[PDB]
Each structure stands twice: as structure tokens, then as C-alpha cells.
Design a protein around this ligand. Structure first.
Ligand SMILES: Cc1cc2nc3c(=O)[nH]c(=O)nc-3n(C[C@H](O)[C@H](O)[C@H](O)COP(=O)(O)OP(=O)(O)OC[C@H]3O[C@@H](n4cnc5c(N)ncnc54)[C@H](O)[C@@H]3O)c2cc1C
Ligand SMILES: NC(=O)C1=CN([C@@H]2O[C@H](COP(=O)(O)OP(=O)(O)OC[C@H]3O[C@@H](n4cnc5c(N)ncnc54)[C@H](OP(=O)(O)O)[C@@H]3O)[C@@H](O)[C@H]2O)C=CC1
Lengths: 143, 255, 93
């Protein structure tokens, strides 16, 4: 492989969710690439530390289609696989109209609601987290 | 072999490749001595337009570009000699050739709407979702795909548990017909879904061989050893309506 | 703009755990850490003491390690504010 030139982090990484016992991380479209890191980091903390202030983290992924973001499905798979303290509950919301579904969306929908699970993991993705189709119900979720 | 260009659909750029014409197999390779395709002929049709589109019988259509129209004639003559040594030719418009033969974008755009038409009853979406405007749909469902290509079509990696498990249930390649045939049987309404899946024309009558094909698919649902003879005996003793014959706290709820 | 930014920051209100009258006129103040208080080594904070009724904020380097549950400041009696803080924290209650 070729060699790369790296210019170090510019993030200035605010992490105020550690300041709250319960946090709701909402990711939308392209604005969900960082959360992978975040999620992994969080679970790693919950693995090594014991008296953490954030007792429960909710990750509301909202996307039209998971195209170009299928890797995030495997990242979430590993995140929930290593979450031994049930710190993170993930909720995926596909907002694509059913009339415009691609192959992946149709397969995910049927494996979610018209094809039986195996161990509460969808046969297509493999996630205990439930995928929902439509606009996320934010204020009923908050109540 | 000789250097030329290969098309990859309306939205993709052409690739400069090389063509080697062996009798048993014609090999299109990359410029880095990397083989891209090796099509073997079993004793297919060709269309000319600068462009030469060979329509594989059960594989992806292959469109090659020529340096010149006379160069197109020379390359076509060489390829025809090599292929006939181990035979239908036609001519159509360039746009007609591009939008007629199976391309990747066109195949995906057809398969998505075909799947939506199939599973409209489950998705609770009206059948007016899109237009599947038959024979080309049958060809698209017939095309068997390698594991990597199929996983790419479904947006998965070649070594994912879902694709590997369905390949194990389907077994070297896989066609979408067998894929969804396994899927629907593993999904009473299954009989209606399978019947409407084999009703390409939409008239509602599986004429002669689609009934036996559906019987064989439902046998592929149920693992057995005497499959063919048992299915034949069942069909003989028995003979849609064919379905009847065969049967004889957190709040997360999206709008 | 600087005053508006200073207003924008939310000044936490905290309580002291222990006060020591260290020799050479030093005050060791160990006080309760706010819940989401994350800092690195060598960082400094600002403090105010309303027991003086002055609302002055003065800077002091955090002498406690980040792994500690509390925050420590070693304030030198250099002038009026520091001496007044020392004498007011000299007595208990
Ligand atoms: C980053 C930083 C960290 C510090 N950490 C410590 C510490 O850990 N322990 C400690 O004892 N002292 C520390 N100081 C010194 C700090 O200035 C004290 O708060 C100061 O001695 C308080 O003096 P006073 O107001 O009581 O007396 P004054 O007579 O008002 O102060 C006299 C001296 O204090 C300085 N001073 C007063 N107010 C301020 C202010 N708001 N900002 C900057 N300088 C001021 C003046 O320059 C003057 O030279 C630190 C200063 C800085 C800038
Ligand atoms: N932090 C930030 O500032 C971020 C900004 N952006 C900006 O957003 C723009 C578009 O993002 P893109 O990558 O296309 O994301 P997408 O539109 O592809 O996906 C975002 C998801 O949110 C839903 N959504 C989008 N807009 C609205 C809205 N107004 N009201 C309710 N739901 C909505 C969409 O559902 P549906 O389309 O089905 O309604 C979609 O599922 C980009 O130009 C980018 O600059 C993106 C990410 C982070």
C-alpha cells in the first residue's frame, strides 16, 4: 500500500454526554460517521471503568438509506456485541419511502418484520436493535 | 489480443482494457495484466453500432468500444472467427444498444422495482409504486452471480453471515430467482407470493413449465432425497387456485 | 465581546470539603468536583467567594490530579483577596 501524509486531529472533541447520566445521540445522514468512534469509545469506557456518570446512552440513527453507510451497521454490530453493561440502545430509522426502496432496504424491511429472527438478531443485518421505517417519534420517545 | 475500451453503463466511465480471443474462452483483461472476465462459450448473440455489444446467455451483457468503425469491423471479424471456431448478429442504435442490453444501473433499477412489485402485499405499498415495463425481467432474474457480485448487489461484504448462509441454502453461483425462491418459502400467503413471482406476464396463468418450476422450488424449501419423483407424483395426483391445489416502557414507533 | 463571553460561560456553584492553613501563609482548599468536570493536568480554574461579598473571580492552578474525586487549590496569601480568603477560611463552619 502507498504511504500517507497525516495532519493531526482538528476535532476539538466536546464530550458533554459524559456530563449527563442519560444521553440521546441523534445521527442524521452524513452526520453519523463520527458516532461510530463515539459509540465504540463509550462501550470501551463502560468495559474498563465502573463508576461512570453516563448510565444509559441512546443512539438514534436517522437515515434515508444505509447506502455508503453499510459499514456502520457492522460497527454497531460490534458495539452492541461488546456492550456488556447494556449502556447503548440503538434505534435505526429508515426514512425512505417504500415505493423507492432499493434491494438492501427491501431485504432489511422483510428480515425485520416479515422474516423470523434467529436470536433476536435480524437475518440480514444481525442487530438486536430494531429498525423502524418512517420519521422518528422524537417527543413520544422523550416522554 | 488488442487494446480497446469497455462501457459500464450511462453513469460509469469507460475502462481501457485488452481483449484476448481463445477458442474455449474469450478473456477481457485490465491493462495491468489483470483478467477482468473470462467468458466460456457452450455449443449467444452480438449487436454492432464503434460499439459492439455481445449479449451473454445467462451472464452480464458485454459492451466493447472500438478505435474506429473500420477497427470495429476488424475486431468484430476476429472475435466472430474466434467464437465460431469453438451465431446471430444484429445492428441497432447506439442509445438503443445502451438502454437495451443489460447494464448494471439498468439491472439494479429493474430488480428494485420488481422486488417492490413482488412484496407490495407485505410492504403495504400500492402496486402503482413504479413501472416494470417481461422477457428482460426474466433474463435479469436468470442471471447467476458470484458471491462478491451478489453481496455487492445487496450492499454486503462477500463474507457476511447472511449471504454465506443463503448461499449454503442455495448449494457455485446464485441467481436472484433462486434467492427469492428460498426467501419467500423461508419467509398460506407464501403460495400466492410465489405464484405472482412466477407470473411474469401478469395474466394469472402459469402455462406449462412454471407450475413444475414452482413445485421444484417449494421442494427446494423442504430438504429431501427423492425430491423429483415425489414432486412429479404429487403433480400427477393433484391436477392462486394452484395455491389451493398445493395446500390440498420506551415508545419507538415511527410514523 | 469578552464580557459577553464571560457571561456566556455557566459559573458552577460548589462547596468546600477541607481547608488547611499551610505554613508560609498558604491555603489548601479541597472542594467538591462538579459532575461533568473534565480537565487535564496543569489546567487552571477561576474561583469566587461570596462570603467576601465581592463577586471577584481569581485564577488558580489545579494542584490535584484529574484522577482525584475532588479539586485542590494551593492559594498563596499575596494580597487583599487572598489574605481575606485565608482569614475567612481559617475558622470552621
Ligand atoms: C494561570 C494562573 C494560575 C495561578 N495559580 C495560582 C495558584 O495555584 N496559587 C496561587 O496562590 N496563586 C495563583 N495565581 C496568582 C493569582 O494572580 C492570584 O489569584 C493572585 O495572587 C490573587 O491576588 P489578590 O487579588 O489576593 O491580591 P492583589 O494585591 O489584588 O494581587 C497582587 C498581584 O496579583 C495579581 N492578580 C490579581 N488579580 C489577578 C487576576 N484576576 N488575574 C491575574 N493576576 C492577578 C496581580 O498581577 C498582582 O501582581 C495564578 C495566576 C494565574 C494567571
Ligand atoms: N451537523 C451538521 O451540521 C450536519 C449537516 N449536514 C448537512 O445536511 C445536508 C444534507 O445532508 P444529507 O447527507 O443529504 O442527509 P440525508 O438527507 O441524506 O439524510 C438525513 C436524514 O434526515 C431526514 N431529514 C433530512 N432533512 C430533514 C428535515 N428538514 N426534516 C425532517 N427530517 C429530515 C431525511 O429523511 P427524508 O429525506 O426521508 O425526509 C434523511 O433520512 C448536507 O448539505 C450537509 O451539509 C449533514 C450532516 C450533519
Amino acid at each position: 500500500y502507498p504511504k500517507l501524509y497525516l495532519d493531526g486531529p482538528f476535532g476539538e472533541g466536546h464530550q458533554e454526554w459524559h456530563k449527563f447520566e442519560v444521553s440521546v445521540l441523534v445521527g442524521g445522514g452524513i452526520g453519523v460517521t463520527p458516532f461510530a468512534s463515539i459509540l465504540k469509545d463509550l462501550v470501551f469506557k463502560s468495559s474498563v471503568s465502573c463508576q461512570v456518570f453516563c448510565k444509559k446512552i441512546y443512539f438514534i440513527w436517522v437515515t434515508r438509506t444505509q447506502r455508503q453507510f453499510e459499514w456502520l451497521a457492522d460497527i454497531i454490530r460490534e458495539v452492541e456485541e461488546n456492550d456488556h453493561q447494556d449502556l447503548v440502545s440503538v434505534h435505526i430509522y429508515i426514512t425512505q419511502l417504500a415505493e423507492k426502496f432499493d434491494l438492501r432496504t427491501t431485504m432489511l424491511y422483510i428480515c425485520e418484520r416479515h422474516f423470523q429472527k434467529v436470536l433476536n438478531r435480524s437475518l440480514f443485518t444481525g442487530l438486536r436493535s430494531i429498525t423502524h421505517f418512517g420519521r422518528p417519534p422524537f417527543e413520544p420517545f422523550f416522554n | 489480443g488488442m487494446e480497446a475500451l469497455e462501457w459500464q453503463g450511462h453513469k460509469e466511465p469507460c475502462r481501457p482494457v485488452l481483449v484476448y480471443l481463445q477458442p474455449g474462452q474469450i478473456r477481457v483483461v485490465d491493462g495491468r495484466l489483470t483478467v477482468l472476465r473470462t467468458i466460456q462459450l457452450q455449443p449467444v448473440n452480438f449487436v454492432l453500432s464503434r460499439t459492439l455489444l455481445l449479449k451473454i446467455p445467462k451472464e452480464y451483457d458485454l459492451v466493447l468500444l472500438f478505435n474506429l468503425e473500420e477497427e470495429r469491423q476488424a475486431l468484430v471479424e476476429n472475435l466472430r472467427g474466434a467464437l465460431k471456431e469453438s451465431i446471430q448478429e444484429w445492428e441497432l442504435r447506439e442509445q438503443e444498444l445502451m438502454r437495451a442490453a443489460v447494464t448494471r444501473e439498468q439491472r439494479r433499477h429493474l430488480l428494485e422495482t420488481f422486488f417492490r412489485h413482488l412484496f407490495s402485499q407485505v410492504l403495504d405499498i400500492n402496486q402503482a409504486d413504479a413501472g416494470t415495463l417481461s422477457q428482460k425481467v426474466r433474463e435479469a432474474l436468470t442471471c447467476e452471480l458470484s458471491r462478491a457480485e451478489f453481496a455487492e448487489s445487496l450492499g454486503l461484504k462477500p463474507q457476511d453471515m447472511f449471504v454465506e448462509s443463503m448461499f449454503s441454502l442455495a448449494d457455485g453461483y446464485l441467481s436472484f430467482r433462486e434467492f427469492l425462491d428460498i426467501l419467500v418459502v423461508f419467509m398460506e400467503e407464501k403460495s400466492r407470493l410465489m405464484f405472482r413471482m412466477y407470473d411474469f406476464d401478469g395474466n394469472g396463468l402459469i402455462s406449462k413449465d412454471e407450475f413444475i418450476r414452482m413445485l421444484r422450488s417449494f421442494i427446494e424449501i423442504s430438504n429431501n432425497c427423492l425430491s423429483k419423483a415425489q414432486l412429479a407424483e404429487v403433480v400427477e395426483s393433484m391436477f392462486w387456485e394452484d395455491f389451493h391445489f398445493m395446500l390440498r416502557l420506551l415508545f419507538t414507533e415511527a410514523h | 465581546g469578552d464580557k459577553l463571553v464571560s457571561l456566556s460561560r455557566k459559573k458552577v456553584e460548589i462547596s468546600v470539603v477541607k481547608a488547611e492553613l499551610l505554613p508560609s501563609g498558604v491555603t489548601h482548599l479541597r472542594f467538591q468536583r462538579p459532575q461533568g468536570f473534565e480537565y487535564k493536568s496543569g489546567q487552571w480554574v477561576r474561583i469566587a467567594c461570596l462570603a467576601l461579598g465581592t463577586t471577584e473571580y481569581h485564577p488558580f492552578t489545579l494542584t490535584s490530579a484529574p484522577h482525584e474525586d475532588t479539586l485542590s487549590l494551593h492559594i498563596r496569601a499575596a494580597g487583599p483577596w487572598t489574605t481575606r480568603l485565608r482569614e475567612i477560611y481559617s475558622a470552621p463552619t
